[PDB]
Amino acid sequence: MITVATAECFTHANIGLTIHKAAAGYEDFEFKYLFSEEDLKLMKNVRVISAMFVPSIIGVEKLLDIKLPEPDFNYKYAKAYSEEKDLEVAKLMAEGLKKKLNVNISIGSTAGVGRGAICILTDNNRYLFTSDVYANLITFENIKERQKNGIEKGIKRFLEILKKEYF
Amino acid sequence: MITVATAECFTHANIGLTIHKAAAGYEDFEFKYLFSEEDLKLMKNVRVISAMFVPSIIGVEKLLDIKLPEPDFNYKYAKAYSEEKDLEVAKLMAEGLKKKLNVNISIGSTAGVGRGAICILTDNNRYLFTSDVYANLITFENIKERQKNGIEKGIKRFLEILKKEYF
Numbered sequence: 001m002i003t004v005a006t007a008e009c010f011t012h013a014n015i016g017l018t019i020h021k022a023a024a025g026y027e028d029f030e031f032k033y034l035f036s037e038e039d040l041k042l043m044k045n046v047r048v049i050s051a052m053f054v055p056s057i058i059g060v061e062k063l064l065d066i067k068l069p070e071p072d073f074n075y076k077y078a079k080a081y082s083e084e085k086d087l088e089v090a091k092l093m094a095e096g097l098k099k100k101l102n103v104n105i106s107i108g109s110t111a112g113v114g115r116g117a118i119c120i121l122t123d124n125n126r127y128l129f130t131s132d133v134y135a136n137l138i139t140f141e142n143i144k145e146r147q148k149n150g151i152e153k154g155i156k157r158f159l160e161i162l163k164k165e166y167f
Numbered sequence: 168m169i170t171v172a173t174a175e176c177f178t179h180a181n182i183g184l185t186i187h188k189a190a191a192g193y194e195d196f197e198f199k200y201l202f203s204e205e206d207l208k209l210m211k212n213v214r215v216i217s218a219m220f221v222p223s224i225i226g227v228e229k230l231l232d233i234k235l236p237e238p239d240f241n242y243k244y245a246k247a248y249s250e251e252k253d254l255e256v257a258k259l260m261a262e263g264l265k266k267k268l269n270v271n272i273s274i275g276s277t278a279g280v281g282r283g284a285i286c287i288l289t290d291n292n293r294y295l296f297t298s299d300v301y302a303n304l305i306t307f308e309n310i311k312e313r314q315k316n317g318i319e320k321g322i323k324r325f326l327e328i329l330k331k332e333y334f
Contacts, residue, residue, distance in 0.1 A: 005226070013179075013180050013184070013218070017179055017220055020222065023244055024243075024244040024245070047223070047243060048220075049221075049223040050220060050221050050222075050223065050230060051219070051220040052180075052217055052218070052219040052221075052230075053215075053217065053218045053219070054216075054217045054219075055187065055215060055216075055217075056214065056215070058216060059172065059216040059217035059268060062267060062268055063219075063230055063267070063268075077191040078191070100229060101226060101230075140193075
């Protein structure tokens with residue numbers, strides 16, 4: 001099977017949970033609209049090993065045996081980075097997760113202040129993009145919209161990548 | 168902070184995600200209805216370190232450095248146990264988490280065929296309970312009802328335990 005794992009913060013593990021639901025053939029799920037019927041057939045060849053929500057630096061670091069940069073902001077509930085460090089962390093987590101779990105495709109996501117970042121790392125390439133929504137984890141400005149767009153864009157890109165590289 | 172981590176399978180990391188959204192003061196989230204305003208004030212003192220959806224044995228094993236029993240059924244997308252091993256695995260994962268991440272409260276959940284199991288392990292005690300719903304991960308029979316019941320029961324027990332032990 002094509003194995004996937006994720007380490008997600010702003011998208012709340014829903015990239016990986018959607019991939020799982022699609023792969024396991026759930027009849028209805030929140031972001032099913034992103035998958036064509038043919039996509040849903042392709043998805044049955046995918047297995048999710050883990051989808052982790054990892055808001056804390058110490059959690060990411062201990063679970064993946066990596067080191068993250070210091071947060072840019074004081075915030076109790078989650079590591080809070082500017083967009084530059086979110087882009088760096090999404091790559092650090094995707095890379096660490098791929099190594100930890102030996103999966104075909106690893107996904108990292110993080111967003112603090114700004115548009116956040118999603119990294120999709122396959123056996124062949126590393127993709128890294130922001131979301132399309134500027135938001136602020138601390139003030140909650142646009143946070144739900146950023147989470148939604150991050151999950152939609154992460155899934156849309158995952159599907160494109162999966163088809164390009166594996167089908 | 169009172170730190171929490173979860174390793175969830177049938178509840179799709181939503182016990183730990185609900186704890187996080189309550190703790191971080193989200194004004195709307197799916198299971199917010201389970202919390203009073205006073206419970207939400209207490210929750211501000213909780214931090215989630217990680218909430219992981221870990222359907223794979225090899226996933227769980229590699230992330231938490233534990234060994235899980237062999238599945239009772241063949242199933243491609245997740246480890247599939249009957250009740251006896253679900254109850255063992257919820258406890259093994261809560262114990263593993265608590266060791267790997269050194270949290271105050273760890274929560275394990277798993278359900279294959281049967282009612283599933285949730286373990287809440289605190290600094291002082293271990294709680295282990297089935298959901299109320301018999302379901303089957305492979306056939307999808309009652310899966311969604313069991314998921315929702317497990318989340319609600321998990322969160323309700325977590326709030327009882329948190330109050331009894333920490334407030």
